[PDB]
Symmetry: C3
Subunit: 130 residues, 3 copies
């Protein structure tokens, strides 16, 4: 039983890993709010999905990619020339070995983080155990 | 247990209200009710939910749609476009639910698209684990 | 049973056609066919599908992408931006499938992005229940 869901509490920007630290669900305790990383304990096939809200007001574009051990497994862009809010979102199904890390990383731009409203999110669960 | 649903919004809505997804495609367990717009948990456990609400085009610039558990925000989303283009308010959650708990999408400002059968605006969910 | 797939689009496409996601990451059950872009049901049951299709930026203002079961639309989505910005057509369904049923994403007008490694445009699904 492994499943998690968390929101961004704070704004982040640039090329950093997103620390989703408004934790709603964390069965198995394999997601780490301090780092923003899911670290596999139970090897198997996993679903992950993410929804990152681009900060409105300036910068035009924002990129957010889902990485496995630092390697891109899905990418997303949010873009609006009038500086409107928009979302960078995607979903994956991956294999994870014990120790494998999964996280969302910015690749330019500004994401909003809201102190309780869970606009920007990250979730995942195990589909099959190896 | 077999508990899963998928429904589209058949009519436009623009109020501060629960979105009644009434184009029901799937409803194993029949825990989703098109009349209220709500999924009511009857088997405690862990559930996945996702929603995709299309903002009405050519008529306004912002729309908000939130997923609630009982009446409480568990995810929020915004669609925004200064040129009144179509755009989506979309998000996904994983929640633990108790018997009698309700999960649903509330429109929280702005105008949403609903239509007869194309299922542009949607709501789905399924149980991952039984507790 | 194990039935689960995730694939990305390697290759630009446009118009009115089945999107053939060809960067196949996961394909347990071997029921997704990159050559046709179709998932063909082997094990009758209840299935989750989701898709995210990136509209090409800098060239066009609207793009439609629909999830179909056999001939039939079961979810629709639109990307639209008057300034030709990148934006996504994305939606999710839960469907019952009989053996032989085909599920795929169809472009319904407009231009989609595909590229080699980044997987901006994606299609995934998995069985939730066996009949």
């Amino acid at each position: 039983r492994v499943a998690f869901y968390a929101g961004l509490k704070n704004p982040h920007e640039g090329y950093e890993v997103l620390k989703f630290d408004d934790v709603v669900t964390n069965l198995g305790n394999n997601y780490d709010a301090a780092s923003g990383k899911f670290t596999c304990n139970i090897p198997g096939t996993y679903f992950f999905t993410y929804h990152v809200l681009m900060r409105g007001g300036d910068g035009t574009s924002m990129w957010a990619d889902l990485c496995k051990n630092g390697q891109v497994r899905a990418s997303a862009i949010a873009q609006d020339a009038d500086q409107n809010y928009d979302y960078a979102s995607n979903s994956v199904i991956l294999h994870l070995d014990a120790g494998d890390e999964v996280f969302i990383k910015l690749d330019g731009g500004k994401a909003h983080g809201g102190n309780s409203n869970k606009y920007s999110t990250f979730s995942g669960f195990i589909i099959y155990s190896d």
